[PDB]
Amino acid sequence: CIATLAPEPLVEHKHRTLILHLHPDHPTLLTTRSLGSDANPTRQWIERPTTVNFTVTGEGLEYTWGNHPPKRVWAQESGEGNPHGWPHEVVVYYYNRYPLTTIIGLCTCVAIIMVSCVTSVWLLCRTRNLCITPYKLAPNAQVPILLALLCCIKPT
Amino acid sequence: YEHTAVMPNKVGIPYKALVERPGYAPVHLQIQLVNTRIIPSTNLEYITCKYKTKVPSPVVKCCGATQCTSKPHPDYQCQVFSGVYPFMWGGAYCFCDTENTQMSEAYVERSEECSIDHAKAYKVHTGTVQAMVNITYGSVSWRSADVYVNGETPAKIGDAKLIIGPLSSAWSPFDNKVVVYGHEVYNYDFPEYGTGKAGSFGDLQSRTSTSNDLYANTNLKLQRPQAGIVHTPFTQVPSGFERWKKDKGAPLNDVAPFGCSIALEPLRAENCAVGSIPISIDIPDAAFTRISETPTVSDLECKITECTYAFDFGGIATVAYKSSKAGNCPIHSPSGVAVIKENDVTLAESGSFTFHFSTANIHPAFKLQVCTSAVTCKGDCKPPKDHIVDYPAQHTESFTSAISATAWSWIKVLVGGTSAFIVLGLIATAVVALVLFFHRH
Amino acid sequence: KAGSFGDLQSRTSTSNDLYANTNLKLQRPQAGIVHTPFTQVPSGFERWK
Amino acid sequence: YVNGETPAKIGDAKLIIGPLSSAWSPFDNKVVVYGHEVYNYDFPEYGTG
Ligand SMILES: *[C@@H]1O[C@H](CO)[C@@H](O)[C@H](O)[C@H]1NC(C)=O
Ligand SMILES: *[C@@H]1O[C@H](CO)[C@@H](O)[C@H](O)[C@H]1NC(C)=O
């Protein structure tokens, strides 16, 4: 038997997004699945003009619109920002490319650099206290002037 | 000559290699997978379809009481309703006003439509994995022959012996129990034979399409005929086949992970790119040519002209190739950060040749093996503008394909900054310790 | 756009430019039949109405 | 049928027998049938002999 063929969707592409404008004559079935380990399948009965915004990854997506043959799409690495340029541009590029291994990355390269900074600063404070406390404890001394500088020391 | 390797299970993406044999010039090998079928071993359990309540003619006993007789029939119900005064066009079917009996009998049968539409319940456990492979080696053209992916069955593709398989991952989209309806396959935990409830699914179960057991539980209950009417009323739960048909959610043809396409003669899942496939080809010795009769390429210098990390062949490079003699010569990039489009280049005595390649790196630094000698190509690549494409990627990312020189320099400066600060702290501690010790002692 | 409003726009009621974007795609005729099948997005004027 | 869900109409009693507690089976994955004998042979795969 002859079955209806729904009007073709109008397809617009955004970064990692497929925007389909669907104009059915009759209630039409729209099914999508991602071509990776998790299908994330979506099944929908579209009866009214509708815009749908499926997220396409690099692994792929496959969408069937009505009795049309299934159509497979893949998203390229076409995100926004300027690698090779200023640090803020680098962050926005890697946030568009990888949303949740930059947040983690920044957060664990910033907490880590902070932790290292405070430990090394504490160690430097301790060595300073140790360097100066003897000379402090001798109100009279000639001061090892180069050391008088290298720590803060108010010489004789 | 034997050549072992491992290639991804992706369909359509050619695996390329350079088979090098000591004493002979390399031969270019190209193995591509046209399709890969995971073909389970099924076992038909039963077939379900709509029922037809066959209602034979009622037995009307004029001045008598005729009584029930159980028959070996699916959901057979016989009732003996008494005190019936049937009227039909002649008018007065039995004389006796009240001592009249009608025997109403009904039994469910397989519908006429069971031979065309029905649901087949299957238990699948594990079958073979079959594939069609295209191979080329040297000047031999495409061969396109069919193989079993078990790792032990040779396939004579032209004049080469291919021992493909086994698949690294034993994943199969089908669960233990499946239901086939038309061209759709469902992962339905169907009820066992003789268990099916009244109206959900498997209310009518037949082992085969021509069986005679035909278990059927549809709650047939004969009702009392209407005054004066000879007929056989009955009440039944509506067919669970149709309830299933309008309540079945989604076939395995759509849900199925990895892009399995489910075909149904035989039941198989095709072209799902999961895991990797070992391969072992045996190229004939006629393909190989002695290393002396092949050109020597020297003074190789590669420059990447415009490049972009698109999914298609978004890179062009040119190599200056001052050579000894003229002829065809293979080219390959083994690093795995670039995939070269062309297999061979024709070389004159000197000049330059251009080759296309695909890559995912911002900076593709890859070694190209021309003939015997090798040249390193490095350059910079721009993002592709197109967001969504209609073809799979021809390359593979590696978790370093995006870092780029600036961000590398940043991770350097950061890591080095922490390291230097901590190492300066530890060196400061050592210096204080030494200065105190020399004070005291 | 094709089907929201102003899919068919004419400067006047008697103009000849008649911009019209309605995603007209012709389909292959059925086997053995002389006809001109086509597919189109339904009018955005009535969707607006 | 010993599955624990399939009734069997024995005379006028309904028996739902099974399932067997142990899933043990004498046969290994690969067997060879010759006449009336059965062997647990790890037979070579097709094309390997
Ligand atoms: C889809 O995206 C378009 C444009 O970004 C927007 O106009 C529309 O509201 C979105 N719809 C949904 C359901 O997200
Ligand atoms: C690969 O084999 C197919 C048939 O399976 C054949 O049509 C095709 O020509 C081969 N590949 C190329 C590049 O020719």
Residue numbers in the entry:
A (entry chain J): 263 to 418
B (entry chain I): 1 to 441
C (entry chain A): 197 to 245
D (entry chain M): 148 to 196
Can you list sentences taken from the study reporting this PDB entry?
Alphavirus spike proteins comprise trimers of heterodimers of glycoproteins E2 and E1 that mediate binding to cellular receptors and fusion of virus and host cell membranes during entry. We recently identified very-low density lipoprotein receptor (VLDLR) and apolipoprotein E receptor 2 (ApoER2) as cellular receptors for EEEV and a distantly related alphavirus, Semliki Forest virus (SFV). Here, we use single-particle cryo-electron microscopy (cryo-EM) to determine structures of the EEEV and SFV spike glycoproteins bound to the VLDLR ligand-binding domain and found that EEEV and SFV interact with the same cellular receptor through divergent binding modes.
To determine whether VLDLR binding causes conformational changes in EEEV E2–E1, we also determined the cryo-EM structure of unliganded EEEV VLPs and determined maps of unliganded q3 spikes (resolution of 3.0 Å). During receptor binding, the loop that contains H155, K156, and R157 in the central arch of the E2 β-ribbon connector undergoes a small conformational change. There are otherwise no conformational changes elsewhere on the EEEV spike glycoprotein. Importantly, E3 density is present in our maps, unlike in the structures reported by Adams et al. and Cao et al. or in prior structural studies of EEEV. Thus, the presence of E3 in our VLP samples likely prevented us from being able to visualize a three LA repeat-binding mode on the EEEV spike protein.
